[PDB]
DNA sequence: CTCATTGAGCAAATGAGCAAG
DNA sequence: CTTGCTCATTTGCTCAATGAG
């Protein structure tokens, strides 16, 4: 229901872009975020990266946000992870949840009935996932880099 | 009515009962309505829906039967919501479709004209929640029984 | 008058699909 | 293949008439 405004949105895609770009190279300390440690243990050591990245300070800092906002949903973190960090698109995260979905009570078209959601649901439920993620980071990082700019 | 979890115990049943009905392997000996339902449907068929074992069918095939026996219009509705899978909206839309004029006494001053598609949704949840009601203590009373 | 019933319709959810990039 | 859309269907829920008690 709630969303950012389409510059906050674009700002906090940019920056987030960056910062996965920055964590898929193995550059973020595993000591600062056990979920993001656990989902680099798999990916290939020698990786190919064409992304732009940001630099270590900021790197560290927008991870650090990420991961107080991020820690208690687990599922929106992996979708955050594989959306900016791997890079996967929309369309392939809503396939594999797709693929692997518990049949659940599907409302009103569904006519409340227990099935497994289509693949347009799953879709909906990933842009709505990564929406209210940015929704909730927002603030805390823009917060964040006002502080570090006074404070600095 | 019933409970929620009441409800949704007897609506995962006859949902596998229904799939089970529909694909065939119900005697007709067993329910003569539920033969003339089968009449009526595409022979060659896919499935792609969960159903249960021959015993459960039967059990269930019994027990429904013996409660609905008597309102053919609600059991057709029934089959027509578990065993073909249509919706209560399509089954409503259907019997407005096919409803000859009714005499309608609160909107509509008295006149013989055929009854709006609210009423008919109206109608039809609450002949599928009767239905419901009315099954449960049987089948659950057979299904501990047969122990 | 009070209020249950009918007629009418809407917002949200879901499934399916499509065209440009 | 991706993305952002359109279109149709289902459900539960309101709101205005309208007549019985
Ligand atoms: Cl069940």
Not at 65 to 78: N, R
């Amino acid at each position: 229901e709630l969303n950012l405004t389409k510059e906050q949105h674009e700002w906090l895609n940019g920056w987030l872009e960056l910062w996965g770009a920055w964590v898929y190279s193995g550059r973020l300390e595993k000591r600062m975020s056990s979920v993001i440690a656990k989902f680099m243990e798999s990916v290939e050591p020698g990786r190919v990266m064409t992304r732009p990245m940001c630099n270590d300070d900021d790197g560290m800092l927008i991870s650090q946000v990420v991961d107080s906002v991020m820690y208690i949903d687990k599922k929106a973190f992996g979708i955050l992870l594989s959306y900016y960090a791997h890079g996967s698109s929309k369309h392939a995260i809503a396939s594999y949840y797709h693929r692997v979905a518990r049949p659940r009570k599907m409302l009103c078209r569904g006519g409340g009935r227990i099935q497994k959601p289509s693949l347009a649901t799953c879709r909906r439920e990933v842009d709505e996932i990564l929406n209210a993620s940015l929704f909730m980071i927002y603030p805390v990082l823009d917060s964040a880099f006002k502080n570090r700019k006074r404070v600095e």
